[PDB]
């Protein structure tokens, strides 16, 4: 009967069975069947002036007509091709690049943060994920509720970078919350000549020890995969780092920014001590290179030079220069970072 027929919206709701007892507590895919239908087009192939064909053609007022059996079969086949082509488009997808592994979220770019309150676009910033935790918590709604905690980092590759933690019940929401929170916590990191840190940095953040080293150009980023990710966001191109103790991602991220944002530029050292800061490169011979001159008054008292320095040395750094064999895992051939 014509009176027992329901609309498409109601037919798909029942067939898909998305809202159901099984769905909520534990595949059919929706399709639109009016996508390719042009008003005035029927299986019989009639031609309706003003609906599916031109109302006037070459100055002649058209009349009703019907397509021949051959012509209609072509039109039917053409629509079948377009449907198959549309289905092929649906199948076709643009694959994004993986991070540190193919099934992990660490290292995956999720785009720039959203525009600001007054159209402040951040297209020059890139966002990277560092940790994604999917944890189930206890709340009266479902007994055990779900929660996704996502740590991200952002940076423009030109010294400005920041990190934040975002939590939500949906992973998409956690991504948005962390990404836009991090744009509000942008550190500025000082790079020596735009490619490396100004000096060696050693620090312990809680139980996570980081030991960074300033390196010459072309050395690359030989660091923990998370430090490589952040260094690319910061803009550091050549550095070495070693991480020991706990590998907690948050302590490593916090500890990294804590050290990189507290480093002393050459100009700062020249101002503090009043002396010239001179640089000696082995590829330039004995040529003295002046990298920073005191802004105010140049001093005339030479900096005291002890006969034997009291520096506290790391056995790991010194052990190498003492001729001790390194591990088989040290200085292996790796892809360009």
């Amino acid at each position: 009967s014509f009176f027992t027929k329901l609309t498409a919206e109601e037919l798909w709701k029942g067939a898909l069975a998305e809202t159901g007892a099984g769905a909520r507590k534990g595949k059919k895919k929706r399709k639109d069947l009016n996508r390719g239908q042009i008003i005035g087009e029927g299986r019989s192939g009639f031609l309706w002036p003003g609906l599916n064909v031109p109302l006037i053609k070459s100055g002649v007022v058209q009349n009703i007509g019907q397509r021949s059996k051959e012509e209609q079969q072509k039109v039917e086949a053409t629509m079948v091709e377009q449907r198959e082509e549309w289905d092929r488009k649906r199948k076709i997808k643009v694959k994004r690049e993986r991070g540190w592994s193919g099934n992990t979220w660490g290292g995956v770019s999720i785009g720039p943060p959203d525009p600001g309150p007054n159209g402040e676009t951040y297209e020059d910033f890139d966002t990277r994920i560092l940790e994604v935790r999917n944890v189930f918590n206890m709340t009266a709604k479902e007994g055990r509720k779900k929660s996704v905690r996502v740590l991200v980092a952002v940076g423009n590759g030109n010294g400005a970078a920041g990190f934040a933690i975002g939590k939500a019940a949906d992973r998409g929401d956690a991504f948005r919350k962390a990404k836009n929170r991090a744009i509000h916590y942008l550190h500025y990191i000082e790079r020596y000549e735009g490619h490396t840190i100004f000096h060696d940095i050693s620090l312990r953040f809680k139980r996570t020890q980081i030991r960074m080293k300033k390196q010459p150009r072309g050395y690359g980023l030989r660091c923990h995969r998370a430090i490589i990710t952040i260094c690319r966001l910061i803009g550091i191109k050549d550095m070495y780092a070693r991480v020991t103790g706990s590998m907690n991602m948050l302590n490593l991220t916090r500890g990294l920014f804590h050290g990189l944002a507290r480093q002393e530029t050459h100009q700062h050292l020249a101002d503090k001590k009043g002396l010239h800061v001179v640089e000696f490169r082995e590829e330039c011979g004995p040529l003295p290179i002046v990298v920073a001159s005191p802004h105010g008054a140049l001093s005339k008292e030479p900096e005291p030079e002890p006969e034997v320095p009291d520096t506290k040395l790391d056995w790991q750094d010194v052990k190498a220069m003492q001729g001790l064999k390194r591990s088989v895992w040290f200085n292996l051939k790796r892809p360009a970072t």
């Binding site: 014509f2 009176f3 027929k5 609309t7 009016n34 239908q37 008003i39």
Partner: peptide, 14 residues
């Protein structure tokens, strides 16, 4: 009325 509503939906689909 029932018919007139089903007719108008199909005649002006979407």
């Amino acid at each position: 009325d029932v018919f007139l509503r089903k007719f108008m939906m199909g005649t002006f689909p979407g």
